[PDB]
Design an enzyme around this catalytic site. Structure first.
Site, PDB file in Angstrom:
ATOM      1  N   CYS A 166      -4.577  41.976 -51.379  1.00 20.13           N
ATOM      2  CA  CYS A 166      -5.378  40.803 -51.686  1.00 20.13           C
ATOM      3  C   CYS A 166      -6.870  41.159 -51.631  1.00 20.13           C
ATOM      4  O   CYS A 166      -7.323  41.848 -50.707  1.00 20.13           O
ATOM      5  CB  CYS A 166      -5.046  39.703 -50.689  1.00 20.13           C
ATOM      6  SG  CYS A 166      -6.160  38.319 -50.727  1.00 20.13           S
ATOM      7  N   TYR A 198      -3.135  40.480 -46.295  1.00 17.91           N
ATOM      8  CA  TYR A 198      -2.231  40.733 -47.415  1.00 17.91           C
ATOM      9  C   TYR A 198      -2.951  41.969 -47.947  1.00 17.91           C
ATOM     10  O   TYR A 198      -4.021  41.866 -48.534  1.00 17.91           O
ATOM     11  CB  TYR A 198      -2.278  39.611 -48.454  1.00 17.91           C
ATOM     12  CG  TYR A 198      -1.630  38.323 -48.001  1.00 17.91           C
ATOM     13  CD1 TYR A 198      -0.458  38.336 -47.240  1.00 17.91           C
ATOM     14  CD2 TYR A 198      -2.202  37.088 -48.310  1.00 17.91           C
ATOM     15  CE1 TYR A 198       0.127  37.150 -46.796  1.00 17.91           C
ATOM     16  CE2 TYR A 198      -1.627  35.899 -47.872  1.00 17.91           C
ATOM     17  CZ  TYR A 198      -0.460  35.938 -47.112  1.00 17.91           C
ATOM     18  OH  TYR A 198       0.114  34.769 -46.660  1.00 17.91           O
ATOM     19  N   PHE A 232      -9.383  39.428 -50.830  1.00 14.82           N
ATOM     20  CA  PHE A 232     -10.049  38.851 -49.674  1.00 14.82           C
ATOM     21  C   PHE A 232      -9.898  39.730 -48.441  1.00 14.82           C
ATOM     22  O   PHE A 232     -10.823  39.823 -47.633  1.00 14.82           O
ATOM     23  CB  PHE A 232      -9.507  37.451 -49.429  1.00 14.82           C
ATOM     24  CG  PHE A 232      -9.632  36.559 -50.623  1.00 14.82           C
ATOM     25  CD1 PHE A 232      -8.523  35.931 -51.159  1.00 14.82           C
ATOM     26  CD2 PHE A 232     -10.866  36.395 -51.248  1.00 14.82           C
ATOM     27  CE1 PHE A 232      -8.635  35.154 -52.309  1.00 14.82           C
ATOM     28  CE2 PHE A 232     -10.995  35.625 -52.392  1.00 14.82           C
ATOM     29  CZ  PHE A 232      -9.876  35.003 -52.929  1.00 14.82           C
ATOM     30  N   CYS A 233      -8.737  40.376 -48.303  1.00 15.33           N
ATOM     31  CA  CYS A 233      -8.485  41.266 -47.171  1.00 15.33           C
ATOM     32  C   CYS A 233      -9.106  42.623 -47.425  1.00 15.33           C
ATOM     33  O   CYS A 233      -9.589  43.270 -46.501  1.00 15.33           O
ATOM     34  CB  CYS A 233      -6.994  41.444 -46.951  1.00 15.33           C
ATOM     35  SG  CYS A 233      -6.121  39.901 -46.833  1.00 15.33           S
TER      36      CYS A 233
HETATM   37  C1  LIG Z   1       0.882  39.346 -50.788  1.00  9.77           C
HETATM   38  O1  LIG Z   1      -0.109  38.354 -51.150  1.00  9.77           O
HETATM   39  C2  LIG Z   1      -1.059  38.488 -52.137  1.00  9.77           C
HETATM   40  C3  LIG Z   1      -1.173  39.661 -52.930  1.00  9.77           C
HETATM   41  C4  LIG Z   1      -2.156  39.763 -53.945  1.00  9.77           C
HETATM   42  C5  LIG Z   1      -3.106  38.688 -54.242  1.00  9.77           C
HETATM   43  C6  LIG Z   1      -2.981  37.454 -53.387  1.00  9.77           C
HETATM   44  C7  LIG Z   1      -1.955  37.402 -52.366  1.00  9.77           C
HETATM   45  C8  LIG Z   1      -4.026  36.472 -53.819  1.00  9.77           C
HETATM   46  C9  LIG Z   1      -4.137  35.124 -53.107  1.00  9.77           C
HETATM   47  C10 LIG Z   1      -4.487  34.959 -51.606  1.00  9.77           C
HETATM   48  O2  LIG Z   1      -5.377  35.527 -50.972  1.00  9.77           O
HETATM   49  O3  LIG Z   1      -3.715  34.121 -50.918  1.00  9.77           O
HETATM   50  C11 LIG Z   1      -4.760  37.149 -54.950  1.00  9.77           C
HETATM   51  C12 LIG Z   1      -5.923  36.507 -55.705  1.00  9.77           C
HETATM   52  N1  LIG Z   1      -4.157  38.423 -55.120  1.00  9.77           N
HETATM   53  C13 LIG Z   1      -4.579  39.426 -56.153  1.00  9.77           C
HETATM   54  O4  LIG Z   1      -5.713  39.355 -56.616  1.00  9.77           O
HETATM   55  C14 LIG Z   1      -3.725  40.609 -56.783  1.00  9.77           C
HETATM   56  C15 LIG Z   1      -4.179  41.942 -56.428  1.00  9.77           C
HETATM   57  C16 LIG Z   1      -3.502  43.134 -56.894  1.00  9.77           C
HETATM   58  C17 LIG Z   1      -2.353  43.004 -57.722  1.00  9.77           C
HETATM   59 CL1  LIG Z   1      -1.489  44.381 -58.213  1.00  9.77          CL
HETATM   60  C18 LIG Z   1      -1.883  41.718 -58.098  1.00  9.77           C
HETATM   61  C19 LIG Z   1      -2.553  40.519 -57.637  1.00  9.77           C
END
Ligand SMILES: COc1ccc2c(c1)c(CC(=O)O)c(C)n2C(=O)c1ccc(Cl)cc1
Ligand SMILES: COc1ccc2c(c1)c(CC(=O)O)c(C)n2C(=O)c1ccc(Cl)cc1
Ligand SMILES: [Cl-]
Ligand SMILES: [Cl-]
Lengths: 274, 274
Positions: free
Chosen positions: A11, A8, A13-14
């Site tokens: 994300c 993702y 983690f990625c």
């Molecule tokens: C498409 O899927 C996503 C996208 C962003 C995510 C997650 C999953 C998870 C969860 C996971 O890894 O499943 C977290 C914790 N995300 C963020 O921190 C985040 C980062 C930047 C913005 Cl602008 C908004 C939110």
């Protein structure tokens, strides 16, 4: 050694795995996963992303946890020991939660399986090894929890965040439009609780600045990166977690009120310098 | 090296540490903690037992997690490296639960911090090292969960268990009498849910027998202990977890319907053989 990273894009983690692969100039392909249907990851029993499969000729291995992937791929770059053996030192530890949910943690995820020789080769000393381990854990146990509440802190921000998520990620033209408005709403509210559950202040921005400052103080002024001359898994862990907000107001504020930019830019060019 | 073990005699976590210290004929003192007031442990910020403080002359270290104590004390017996450095490789990793609770897990808790030399000295080979690690985790993530539902499975059994807990542990003559009847009741009911939350069968005894059989099959018939000639941390882990039921119906049944006694008795005499 062919590396395929299922992720993702936006994300933490990625981004973390990318920051690592990029810094070590490792060649890999990335298949963007559709957060709604996740068909691109339906080959794995592990139902979380990132997932990284390493193919070595006819053989292949699936590295699941974002911290395990980095730890395994790293001890591999130093020890050269077969990846199929290395991934054996970071086992999936299943357990049933106090709520009845089956959680899976990965053993030794922040420990590189290295021998004295190679360890001396990658670390300053015994205290440098356990320090990054501690900061690796901080990055994803405390730092990531400050992203959402901050990027979805305001309705305008929530929309900008999901615009960037849908634009940056993989969504059908239809579910993209839906997720853009529906998802921004859900996340704006949902994060109101994430902020509480995680014991965050009302001004979530302040929690962000404190962590940022806590980090730069940890790095100190006697060294460019926590890793000394070059960044280590801890530098790359925090960088990877924060980059995810690049372009959003949260990030601009971070840079403007925390004195974290110098180190951030430092880790960035160290990376672009392949 | 003076060892003081703060424990709950009848607890699987304390029995585990005793099984280890005893097997290595390590001399230690034990201060029984009062489960109700826990005054004897109110010197530690770590609020769980067992707790083991190792005093080396003027210096002293507090080893907190039952698996960490065994791992640290063990790598110490083989490497001789200072305990204050060793306990540094098993860090307390704090994180806020998905429910808002602050959980603390210990990094690398099932991994002995040993070098190639000493590792070859204590393990059969690479596969023997990761096998005990996997069974060490099984013992406390799956096996212990079968104790309570089994020893509190029936009202009569509940009373016998708490009689033994109060007799074996440290309770004031007054709170002892209370806990004996009040505690048996609470635990009999509370375990009815523990049995469910943990996805146990209706006949909890069957879950116990299956685990038991799963263990003996793992040990195989080509070796006396999973550790081969002598028992290893995995043998001592399962033994320590099960001993806790010695004297109760659950234990008699275990021995009568599982073919586990031979190994059990084998680990016992290996221990009494100092
Ligand atoms: C498409 O899927 C996503 C996208 C962003 C995510 C997650 C999953 C998870 C969860 C996971 O890894 O499943 C977290 C914790 N995300 C963020 O921190 C985040 C980062 C930047 C913005 Cl602008 C908004 C939110
Ligand atoms: C005095 O304090 C105790 C006693 C027994 C305990 C625990 C705590 C915990 C919890 C902890 O370690 O805090 C567990 C899981 N116990 C058992 O398995 C058990 C063992 C034998 C019998 Cl007969 C009945 C119950
Ligand atoms: Cl799924
Ligand atoms: Cl608002």
């Amino acid at each position: 050694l062919q590396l395929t990273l299922y992720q993702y894009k936006t994300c933490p983690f990625c981004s973390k795995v990318r920051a690592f692969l990029d810094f070590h100039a490792l060649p890999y392909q990335v298949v963007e996963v559709n957060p709604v249907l996740r068909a691109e990851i339906k080959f794995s029993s592990y139902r979380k992303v990132p997932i990284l499969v390493a193919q070595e000729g006819e053989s292949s291995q699936q590295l699941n946890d974002s911290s395990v992937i980095i730890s395994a791929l790293k001890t591999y770059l130093v020890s050269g020991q077969p990846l199929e053996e290395i991934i054996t030192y970071y086992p999936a530890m299943k357990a049933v939660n106090d709520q009845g949910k089956e959680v899976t943690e990965f053993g030794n995820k922040y420990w590189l399986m290295l021998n004295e020789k190679e360890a001396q080769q990658v670390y300053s000393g015994k205290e440098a090894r356990t320090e990054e381990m501690k900061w690796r854990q901080w990055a994803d146990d405390w730092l990531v929890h400050l992203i959402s509440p901050n990027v979805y802190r305001t309705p305008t921000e929530a929309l900008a965040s999901f615009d960037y998520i849908v634009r940056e990620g993989k969504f059908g033209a239809v579910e993209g439009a839906v997720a853009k408005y529906m998802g921004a709403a859900a996340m704006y509210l949902i994060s109101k609780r994430l902020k509480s559950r995680h014991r965050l202040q009302d001004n979530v921005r302040e929690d962000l600045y404190e962590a940022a400052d806590k980090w730069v103080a940890a790095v100190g002024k006697d060294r460019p990166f926590m890793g000394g001359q070059k960044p280590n898994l801890a530098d790359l862990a925090v960088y990877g977690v924060l980059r995810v907000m690049e372009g959003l107001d949260a990030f601009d504020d971070l840079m403007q009120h925390t004195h974290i930019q110098p180190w951030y830019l430092r880790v960035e060019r160290a990376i672009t310098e392949a």
